[PDB]
Design a protein around this nucleic acid. Structure first.
Length: 402
RNA sequence: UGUAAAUA
């Protein structure tokens, strides 16, 4: 910190004015000091004369090197964000040259700033506050090569991609959907902790739900196309993603969203059907199997039920069947509980049994009677287990209501 | 009895 601005105790002075700092040429020393930048952040929020704004503009966002030094700084990045907001609120003659220059600074250093803990906040701020036409040019500065994978899986930069998805029209970031849909890229990005949030946010934005009713028809076509490109890649690697520690959330998200119903159905048939017993015994995919049971259309649900009750040859020596395996399995037991809960919800009115022009009530009662007979016959072994006690209780609570 | 995001 500069000595001219200190007391005889070594502390910063009170009664210090913004203009003294701006006139001193020492702003950069204040902006990276906690006490200095705290002073600047309060001063910058008050009434500013035209010349004060002018100095802040040239000293904070006017030269590329100091702008980057401040943007990547623990304290400075906050001052940068405030001065950008003031710049956007000041419609003087130099407005346009200020905003284009800000676009050029960030554009030339887009990748490095995205991956920085502090500069990625300057990017996120600019994307949602700048004029949309300039914000779109920032998006265009994103890399199209291996760096984009790194950006998606970065603990900081993944939030830049999600911000783009939230506040920029799809036409400007459609290249990201096609980048991510390329099979090798999709594999790397969905099987990563941060990348899986990225893919899920994209899918949500490409979904024709109540949050997108404001799109034009043309924009809905654009959206539907990008959605179908991505769902085609997701459904081709569907087994791999369903069993992965992070990507299983993407499959669950698709399967449980009614506004993705046609993709729910492709996933169930392409990936889960004929593999229900195997996937019910997987740590991560057993969650996907639960979502499938909870949200399948009723004629697929019938096939899923029939696969569990009758799809597998019993063990040649013991006669154990799929239901026997699943009820006592560390993950499969949660899928049987889900099947039981669906059936008790149906017969008690908690779940609508009318679907495609028919009341499937008779089918839920069939499946329930199967579970009830099994749980009755095996009640002694089942009562040794928490899951088993819960099914016995679930059936006892049903006959109490009905 | 079973799994997921970063600034004073």
């Amino acid at each position: 910190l500069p000595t001219w601005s200190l007391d005889s105790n070594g502390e910063m002075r009170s009664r210090l004015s913004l203009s003294e700092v701006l006139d001193s040429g020492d702003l950069m020393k204040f902006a990276v000091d906690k006490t200095g930048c705290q002073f600047l952040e309060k001063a910058v929020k008050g009434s500013l004369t035209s010349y004060q704004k002018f100095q802040l503009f040239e000293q904070v966002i006017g030269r590329k090197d100091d702008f980057l030094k401040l943007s990547t700084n623990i304290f400075g990045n906050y001052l940068v964000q405030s001065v950008i907001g003031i710049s956007l609120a000041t419609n003087d003659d130099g407005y346009t040259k200020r905003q284009e220059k800000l676009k050029n600074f960030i554009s030339s250093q887009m990748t490095d700033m995205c991956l920085d803990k502090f500069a990625c906040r300057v990017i996120q701020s600019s994307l949602q506050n700048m004029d949309l036409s300039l914000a779109c040019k920032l998006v265009q500065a994103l890399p199209r090569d291996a760096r984009l994978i790194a950006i998606c899986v970065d603990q900081n930069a993944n939030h830049v991609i999600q911000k783009v998805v939230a506040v920029i029209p799809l036409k400007n970031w459609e290249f990201i959907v096609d980048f991510v849909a390329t099979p090798e890229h999709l594999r790397q990005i969905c099987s990563d902790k941060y990348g899986a949030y990225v893919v899920s946010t994209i899918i949500e934005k490409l979904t024709a739900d109540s949050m997108n009713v404001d799109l034009t028809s043309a924009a809905q076509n654009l959206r539907e196309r990008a959605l179908q490109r991505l769902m085609t890649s997701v459904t081709n690697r569907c087994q791999e993603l369903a069993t992965n520690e992070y990507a299983n959330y993407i499959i669950q998200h698709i399967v449980s969203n009614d506004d993705l119903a046609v993709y729910r159905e492709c996933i169930i048939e392409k990936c889960l059907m004929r593999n229900l017993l195997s996937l019910s015994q997987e740590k991560f995919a057993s969650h996907v199997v639960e979502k499938a049971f909870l949200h399948a259309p009723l004629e697929l649900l019938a096939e899923m039920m029939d696969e569990i009750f009758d799809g597998y040859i019993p063990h040649p020596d013991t006669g154990k069947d799929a239901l026997d395996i699943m009820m006592f399995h560390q993950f499969g037991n949660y899928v049987v509980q889900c099947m039981l809960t669906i059936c008790c919800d149906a017969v008690s009115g908690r779940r609508q049994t009318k679907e495609g022009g028919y009341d499937h009530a008779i089918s839920f009662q069939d499946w329930l009677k199967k579970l009830h007979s099994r749980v009755t016959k095996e009640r002694h072994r089942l009562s040794r287990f928490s899951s088993g006690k819960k099914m016995i209780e679930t059936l006892a609570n049903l006959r109490s209501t009905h």
